[PDB]
Motif scaffolding. Structure first.
Motif, PDB file in Angstrom:
ATOM      1  N   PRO A 131     -59.937 -42.086 -54.562  1.00 29.31           N
ATOM      2  CA  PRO A 131     -60.601 -43.349 -54.401  1.00 29.31           C
ATOM      3  C   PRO A 131     -62.029 -43.110 -53.875  1.00 29.31           C
ATOM      4  O   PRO A 131     -62.241 -42.090 -53.201  1.00 29.31           O
ATOM      5  CB  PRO A 131     -59.802 -44.037 -53.296  1.00 29.31           C
ATOM      6  CG  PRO A 131     -58.597 -43.225 -53.054  1.00 29.31           C
ATOM      7  CD  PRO A 131     -58.785 -41.869 -53.660  1.00 29.31           C
ATOM      8  N   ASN A 132     -62.928 -44.010 -54.214  1.00 30.85           N
ATOM      9  CA  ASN A 132     -64.285 -44.052 -53.682  1.00 30.85           C
ATOM     10  C   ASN A 132     -64.454 -45.409 -53.024  1.00 30.85           C
ATOM     11  O   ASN A 132     -64.420 -46.428 -53.713  1.00 30.85           O
ATOM     12  CB  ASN A 132     -65.349 -43.862 -54.741  1.00 30.85           C
ATOM     13  CG  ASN A 132     -65.390 -42.495 -55.389  1.00 30.85           C
ATOM     14  OD1 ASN A 132     -66.198 -42.334 -56.289  1.00 30.85           O
ATOM     15  ND2 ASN A 132     -64.577 -41.543 -54.964  1.00 30.85           N
ATOM     16  N   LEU A 133     -64.611 -45.407 -51.717  1.00 24.77           N
ATOM     17  CA  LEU A 133     -64.599 -46.635 -50.936  1.00 24.77           C
ATOM     18  C   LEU A 133     -65.901 -46.853 -50.181  1.00 24.77           C
ATOM     19  O   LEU A 133     -66.560 -45.886 -49.808  1.00 24.77           O
ATOM     20  CB  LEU A 133     -63.437 -46.586 -49.943  1.00 24.77           C
ATOM     21  CG  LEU A 133     -62.060 -46.338 -50.584  1.00 24.77           C
ATOM     22  CD1 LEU A 133     -61.040 -46.108 -49.493  1.00 24.77           C
ATOM     23  CD2 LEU A 133     -61.636 -47.500 -51.484  1.00 24.77           C
ATOM     24  N   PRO A 134     -66.280 -48.109 -49.975  1.00 33.54           N
ATOM     25  CA  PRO A 134     -67.571 -48.341 -49.314  1.00 33.54           C
ATOM     26  C   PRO A 134     -67.449 -48.220 -47.799  1.00 33.54           C
ATOM     27  O   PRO A 134     -66.400 -48.461 -47.203  1.00 33.54           O
ATOM     28  CB  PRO A 134     -67.882 -49.784 -49.727  1.00 33.54           C
ATOM     29  CG  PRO A 134     -66.526 -50.420 -49.780  1.00 33.54           C
ATOM     30  CD  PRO A 134     -65.596 -49.358 -50.312  1.00 33.54           C
ATOM     31  N   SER A 135     -68.557 -47.848 -47.171  1.00 40.27           N
ATOM     32  CA  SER A 135     -68.671 -47.773 -45.726  1.00 40.27           C
ATOM     33  C   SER A 135     -70.027 -48.342 -45.299  1.00 40.27           C
ATOM     34  O   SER A 135     -71.043 -47.793 -45.751  1.00 40.27           O
ATOM     35  CB  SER A 135     -68.615 -46.332 -45.210  1.00 40.27           C
ATOM     36  OG  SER A 135     -68.804 -46.330 -43.794  1.00 40.27           O
ATOM     37  N   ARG A 136     -70.028 -49.371 -44.466  1.00 42.18           N
ATOM     38  CA  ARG A 136     -71.284 -49.912 -43.939  1.00 42.18           C
ATOM     39  C   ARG A 136     -71.868 -49.011 -42.856  1.00 42.18           C
ATOM     40  O   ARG A 136     -73.073 -49.062 -42.636  1.00 42.18           O
ATOM     41  CB  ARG A 136     -71.070 -51.330 -43.387  1.00 42.18           C
ATOM     42  CG  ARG A 136     -70.815 -52.330 -44.508  1.00 42.18           C
ATOM     43  CD  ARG A 136     -70.594 -53.739 -43.980  1.00 42.18           C
ATOM     44  NE  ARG A 136     -69.422 -53.827 -43.128  1.00 42.18           N
ATOM     45  CZ  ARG A 136     -69.008 -54.951 -42.537  1.00 42.18           C
ATOM     46  NH1 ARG A 136     -69.691 -56.072 -42.718  1.00 42.18           N
ATOM     47  NH2 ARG A 136     -67.920 -54.919 -41.775  1.00 42.18           N
ATOM     48  N   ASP A 137     -71.039 -48.211 -42.217  1.00 42.44           N
ATOM     49  CA  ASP A 137     -71.436 -47.285 -41.159  1.00 42.44           C
ATOM     50  C   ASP A 137     -70.464 -46.115 -41.097  1.00 42.44           C
ATOM     51  O   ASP A 137     -69.311 -46.292 -40.684  1.00 42.44           O
ATOM     52  CB  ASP A 137     -71.505 -48.005 -39.806  1.00 42.44           C
ATOM     53  CG  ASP A 137     -71.989 -47.117 -38.668  1.00 42.44           C
ATOM     54  OD1 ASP A 137     -73.125 -46.625 -38.736  1.00 42.44           O
ATOM     55  OD2 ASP A 137     -71.267 -46.879 -37.688  1.00 42.44           O
TER      56      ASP A 137
ATOM     57  N   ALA B 169     -46.621 -52.128 -47.310  1.00 43.03           N
ATOM     58  CA  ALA B 169     -47.384 -52.753 -46.238  1.00 43.03           C
ATOM     59  C   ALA B 169     -48.852 -52.791 -46.629  1.00 43.03           C
ATOM     60  O   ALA B 169     -49.258 -52.345 -47.710  1.00 43.03           O
ATOM     61  CB  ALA B 169     -47.198 -52.004 -44.933  1.00 43.03           C
ATOM     62  N   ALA B 170     -49.714 -53.345 -45.774  1.00 39.84           N
ATOM     63  CA  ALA B 170     -51.119 -53.337 -46.167  1.00 39.84           C
ATOM     64  C   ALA B 170     -51.960 -53.048 -44.926  1.00 39.84           C
ATOM     65  O   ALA B 170     -51.662 -53.553 -43.849  1.00 39.84           O
ATOM     66  CB  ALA B 170     -51.505 -54.642 -46.817  1.00 39.84           C
ATOM     67  N   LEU B 171     -52.988 -52.228 -45.079  1.00 42.04           N
ATOM     68  CA  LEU B 171     -53.974 -51.989 -44.026  1.00 42.04           C
ATOM     69  C   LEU B 171     -55.318 -52.484 -44.541  1.00 42.04           C
ATOM     70  O   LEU B 171     -55.670 -52.222 -45.703  1.00 42.04           O
ATOM     71  CB  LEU B 171     -53.991 -50.507 -43.661  1.00 42.04           C
ATOM     72  CG  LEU B 171     -55.094 -50.019 -42.723  1.00 42.04           C
ATOM     73  CD1 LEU B 171     -54.917 -50.608 -41.339  1.00 42.04           C
ATOM     74  CD2 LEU B 171     -55.092 -48.496 -42.626  1.00 42.04           C
ATOM     75  N   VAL B 172     -56.046 -53.215 -43.715  1.00 45.08           N
ATOM     76  CA  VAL B 172     -57.387 -53.678 -44.076  1.00 45.08           C
ATOM     77  C   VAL B 172     -58.350 -53.019 -43.087  1.00 45.08           C
ATOM     78  O   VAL B 172     -58.151 -53.168 -41.875  1.00 45.08           O
ATOM     79  CB  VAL B 172     -57.476 -55.202 -44.099  1.00 45.08           C
ATOM     80  CG1 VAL B 172     -58.869 -55.676 -44.490  1.00 45.08           C
ATOM     81  CG2 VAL B 172     -56.436 -55.792 -45.070  1.00 45.08           C
ATOM     82  N   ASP B 173     -59.321 -52.256 -43.585  1.00 47.16           N
ATOM     83  CA  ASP B 173     -60.124 -51.389 -42.695  1.00 47.16           C
ATOM     84  C   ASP B 173     -61.309 -52.170 -42.138  1.00 47.16           C
ATOM     85  O   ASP B 173     -61.420 -53.364 -42.473  1.00 47.16           O
ATOM     86  CB  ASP B 173     -60.451 -50.108 -43.446  1.00 47.16           C
ATOM     87  CG  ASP B 173     -61.688 -50.095 -44.292  1.00 47.16           C
ATOM     88  OD1 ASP B 173     -62.304 -51.155 -44.546  1.00 47.16           O
ATOM     89  OD2 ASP B 173     -62.088 -48.994 -44.743  1.00 47.16           O
ATOM     90  N   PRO B 174     -62.181 -51.627 -41.295  1.00 47.44           N
ATOM     91  CA  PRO B 174     -63.319 -52.418 -40.797  1.00 47.44           C
ATOM     92  C   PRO B 174     -64.296 -52.899 -41.858  1.00 47.44           C
ATOM     93  O   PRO B 174     -65.146 -53.725 -41.534  1.00 47.44           O
ATOM     94  CB  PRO B 174     -64.050 -51.425 -39.874  1.00 47.44           C
ATOM     95  CG  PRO B 174     -62.918 -50.563 -39.381  1.00 47.44           C
ATOM     96  CD  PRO B 174     -62.175 -50.285 -40.667  1.00 47.44           C
ATOM     97  N   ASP B 175     -64.246 -52.435 -43.098  1.00 51.53           N
ATOM     98  CA  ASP B 175     -65.198 -52.908 -44.094  1.00 51.53           C
ATOM     99  C   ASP B 175     -64.485 -53.856 -45.072  1.00 51.53           C
ATOM    100  O   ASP B 175     -65.028 -54.244 -46.106  1.00 51.53           O
ATOM    101  CB  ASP B 175     -65.877 -51.744 -44.822  1.00 51.53           C
ATOM    102  CG  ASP B 175     -66.922 -51.055 -43.954  1.00 51.53           C
ATOM    103  OD1 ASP B 175     -67.883 -51.687 -43.481  1.00 51.53           O
ATOM    104  OD2 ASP B 175     -66.790 -49.855 -43.665  1.00 51.53           O
ATOM    105  N   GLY B 176     -63.269 -54.246 -44.722  1.00 52.06           N
ATOM    106  CA  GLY B 176     -62.534 -55.222 -45.507  1.00 52.06           C
ATOM    107  C   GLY B 176     -61.851 -54.633 -46.707  1.00 52.06           C
ATOM    108  O   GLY B 176     -61.432 -55.346 -47.619  1.00 52.06           O
ATOM    109  N   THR B 177     -61.745 -53.305 -46.702  1.00 56.13           N
ATOM    110  CA  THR B 177     -61.150 -52.600 -47.837  1.00 56.13           C
ATOM    111  C   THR B 177     -59.630 -52.663 -47.696  1.00 56.13           C
ATOM    112  O   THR B 177     -59.076 -52.444 -46.619  1.00 56.13           O
ATOM    113  CB  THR B 177     -61.646 -51.147 -47.899  1.00 56.13           C
ATOM    114  OG1 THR B 177     -62.988 -51.083 -48.382  1.00 56.13           O
ATOM    115  CG2 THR B 177     -60.840 -50.298 -48.881  1.00 56.13           C
TER     116      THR B 177
END
Ligand SMILES: [Ca+2]
Lengths: 120, 120
Positions: free
Chosen positions: A6-12, A103-111
């Motif tokens: 996967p390639n996922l976005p990161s704001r920081d 289950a589901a995990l939502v990370d700090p960037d809403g992913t």
């Protein structure tokens, strides 16, 4: 071994690394624009995306896990909250229409990371 | 085994399955909203996204390949064009800014698959 990641976005990158580090991910690569995190055979790659709008985001991936309950346990012990509101957050394992648990995990960037129990 | 998989958009599962089938991928699972393709150890998951604009896409994933050359040879041999715009298309292997080599595949929905040669 061939592998699709996967390639996922990161704001920081610092906050992303710190979040996933609590779940056992370590940094195996990092430069100004790209970061790779690894936890055993799980590999996630992040691109810098300061302009991301988490509420408009369709980013997601699957984590297909041999032990979903361990991982899920780990998320709750480091304090991620079981809730429907805000991010980051987790959603408990539920029987899906396909005979499995997810289950589901939502990370700090809403992913969205879909957590799925491997058919043992 | 633990594994993280990309989740990529498709405006039409039939066009997606037909494109990746020429590259050796088979269908493992398909329903109305989700589809999973496999080629040896490579696993790609697709979700239905009929509103996607392939020309404004931020979706991508990496294929980290034991033999990039072979994969690249298969793309050309099924007639994917090597050009600089439009989709689908291929970008030839390029010695990258890490010492490794990289190519790029753009699929029928504008998704960028970065093709990377593993470090043997
Ligand atoms: Ca066919």
């Amino acid at each position: 071994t061939d592998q699709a990641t996967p390639n996922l976005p990161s704001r920081d990158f610092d906050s992303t690394a710190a979040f996933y580090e609590r779940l056992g991910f370590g940094i195996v690569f990092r430069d100004a624009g790209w970061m790779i995190l690894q936890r055993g055979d799980l590999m996630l790659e992040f691109f810098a995306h300061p302009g991301l709008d988490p509420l408009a985001s369709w980013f997601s991936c699957c984590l297909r896990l041999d032990d979903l309950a361990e991982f899920y346990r780990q998320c709750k012990s480091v304090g991620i909250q079981e809730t429907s509101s805000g991010y980051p957050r987790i959603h408990a394992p539920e029987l899906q229409g396909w005979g499995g648990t997810m289950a589901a995990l939502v990370d700090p960037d809403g992913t969205l990371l879909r957590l799925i129990q491997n058919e043992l």
